[PDB]
Point group: C5
Chain length 168, copies 5
């Protein structure tokens, strides 16, 4: 056991225009994570195509991971960022999580990961896109895998948190 | 116990261009709310991107909450309102509902909330956007959690209700 | 008991540019009607936003009802018609059906209704939009709740029906 | 019952610009055909609206049938073709199938049919659109109901088939 | 007994503008592969229409296969490539896999295949599109059916793989 149900993770890492913000879901075979993984892959639309995360072509990360963008992709520059530095970052994060035991190795062939990726339209430095997404994805997985933050923990610190875009 | 099935809530709070109108769904692990939560997160389209509600980046509200817009988002101003004052409002409403016992604390880690939010394209006051959405979301949760309004109650007062845009 | 599975209803009522045509689904908790209700509410697109049908803000009809448009909504005029006269009509039809026992009162809190609404882009009379949709929605519910028209009934009268846009027949 | 599981049918009938090509799914209550029927009806997008197939308004065909277009519908001419001659043709094909026993009469009230229809943007003859779609839909139903063509049959004749758009 | 759960395959084959890259899912009746197959066929949008893979019209490959594009289809040239050389290639790959026993013949009538295909907008040689997609689809099926690459294998070689658009 360990990851026996759907868990949701999230994390924002970085700064500048390359800042990464990952919204993530992970779950086992037979769970809604598997259903959304399949429903997600077959459904592409203009500006939003979902693809399997791969460390490189012919080397997908395992557990199977589906990546989808949040910001509308209007040109090749945006498409390559999403499926170049960000994809490699997300995929390496997933595989490093397995290597480090965060995602148990003996569960990796029966889990599905869904990763929502943020790339501001002014992002420019590939190295940062790749690093921040690697870090945000890894943090999201670590959190999701432990069901964190627990509701009691969020309740306790809700009043001290600061949302960047809050009216205040 | 208490929230053992899918419940739907709704509420309109506020006035002017910042008026809030929330269409909401809440349900437990294993229910259609969990399925729609996962199917919803992976599917973004131009003008409509769905994201996890967070009190602030790195502090999502629990229960896991998915937010989606009703009015087409054409620019950054609209995007920030939806995912700034409204998001903070929605997320705080969810966490305050947990703190206040409306959503039992011992159920918060196994529930999913889906929140449709309205922001007129002429909305301008962030403070109101945030406050009205916080209030509308809280009201919708309170209602949904009690399965209100009950059908018998709606039937009794259907003839005296006034829809602002109705012909008659 | 009564509405124990997914049922589909349809009806065209009215004339002129305000003519209503409703494509409807109703089903209980645990059925695909509930799944489509949830999957439908969270998924909005340009020109197509789905909302809960309400008699008025703060007074949604019960059973829970999801409304979706068939004709692309390009401006506020169209949006208000869909979620003004038509919404009020759809919602009242659902609530009147409960009041009249068409939808048993003791099942109303555990059912879901999905309503596809048609409003021609030249529709103009709000009173008609509201009335026709109320009438069409009510007819669709009554039909769906009884699983009508039954297949044997459609089979028997297929040759005499006349489609407004067919080549012939 | 005969049709206890999801079956897929397909058929191309006709020629010229009115040629019909149907991709079809049929299945019983409780199957993925019923789920896709419901998920399909509620989800309309620009250029693609799905509707119940009806022999005529106020007379839908039974089994319940959902129709969806393959070619983007940009104007009223295309919309009326799809939901006029083709709709009537599709709906009559379903009803004639029931009348002829291809779809058992005692199963017709508990089945769902999903019909993808093709109408080239240069199609012009309503009579042909109606006839070809009626014929293609009926052939697809007949094939689907028997699970044909069986895999062994396709395997045997794969080398002699000719795709009109293949390189060879 | 061979293919009892959902498996995911992927492969990139070829070069130049016709290079093929397949993201594939295969699964049995009753699995999320069947659900996504049905939900996928009924849902078409501008630039993205999904169709059954056929060796030729009136001869679909079996197991039932749904094809969907990754690159927005803006004109007939792109549409024909996707549903001509690529479709024939994908469908023949599926049928050859059955003939060769990769997909057991006695399981072929109860399996569903989902194929995401890539065709760069500058692709021009139909013969290559067809051949590369045939080989990439066949490789993806072979991999998927064996649950390959296994997580342990990806972990072992993650550091030596090279992604074309990211790199590290
Ligand atoms: C190795 C990489 N990662 C993968 N990873 C997996 N798992 N699978 C894959 O197939 C890929 N590959 C294909 N990937 C891939 C394929 C299609 C799309 C979607 C297309 O990008 C959509 O069609 C729209 O988002 C673009 O719409 C438009 O925007 C562009 C403007 O050109 P420009 O000249 O203005 O620059 C046009 O190409 C047009 O299609 C995204 C990524 C990556 C390039 C590439
Ligand atoms: C009381 C009413 N009923 C409800 N009922 C429920 N359950 N929930 C609600 O939030 C509402 N309200 C909000 N409702 C509502 C909100 C958004 C949309 C759809 C929006 O219209 C989307 O933005 C797109 O589907 C269309 O986008 C279009 O709409 C705009 C019109 O401006 P205009 O200048 O063209 O006139 C354009 O910007 C265009 O992009 C429809 C109804 C009703 C106005 C209103
Ligand atoms: C902290 C905030 N909340 C979050 N909350 C969660 N859970 N996750 C997140 O990633 C975020 N962040 C990212 N969020 C976020 C990211 C993308 C979109 C969708 C985009 O807004 C659209 O996809 C646009 O790409 C298209 O609409 C438009 O917006 C752009 C601005 O140009 P301009 O017109 O303002 O000049 C244009 O490209 C245009 O296409 C919405 C919210 C918030 C800004 C931000
Ligand atoms: C034999 C082939 N494979 C099949 N395979 C199966 N299973 N079923 C089928 O019906 C088909 N056929 C129909 N197929 C088919 C039908 C519609 C679309 C999608 C339409 O093409 C959409 O309308 C948009 O994706 C295109 O947008 C555009 O492209 C078209 C021509 O542009 P152009 O005039 O600039 O050249 C316009 O209609 C426009 O809407 C794709 C493939 C193939 C042509 C064809
Ligand atoms: C009796 C027929 N079959 C049915 N069958 C069922 N089951 N239910 C129904 O409601 C219908 N009816 C309504 N049906 C129906 C309703 C809306 C759409 C969608 C439209 O075809 C478009 O996709 C709009 O959503 C976009 O609106 C766009 O389309 C128009 C183009 O024409 P134009 O440029 O000549 O003007 C524009 O006005 C624009 O607003 C399709 C079929 C059929 C016409 C009609």
């Amino acid at each position: 056991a360990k990851i026996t149900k759907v868990q949701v993770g999230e994390a924002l890492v970085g700064d500048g225009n390359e800042v990464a913000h990952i919204d993530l879901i992970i779950g086992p075979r037979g769970s809604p994570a598997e259903t959304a993984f399949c429903n997600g892959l077959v459904n592409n639309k203009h500006g939003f195509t979902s693809l399997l995360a791969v460390i490189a072509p012919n080397l997908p990360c395992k557990p199977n991971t589906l990546m989808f963008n949040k910001v509308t992709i209007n040109d090749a520059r945006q498409a390559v960022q999403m499926f170049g530095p960000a994809q490699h970052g997300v995929a390496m994060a997933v595989q490093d999580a397995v290597a480090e035991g965060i995602i148990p190795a003996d569960e990796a062939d029966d889990l599905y990961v869904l990763v929502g990726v943020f790339i501001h339209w002014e992002a420019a430095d590939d190295a940062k896109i790749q690093k921040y997404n690697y870090e945000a994805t890894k943090l999201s997985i670590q959190r999701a895998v432990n069901g964190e933050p627990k509701a009691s923990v969020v309740t306790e610190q809700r009043k001290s948190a600061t949302h960047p875009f809050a009216a205040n």
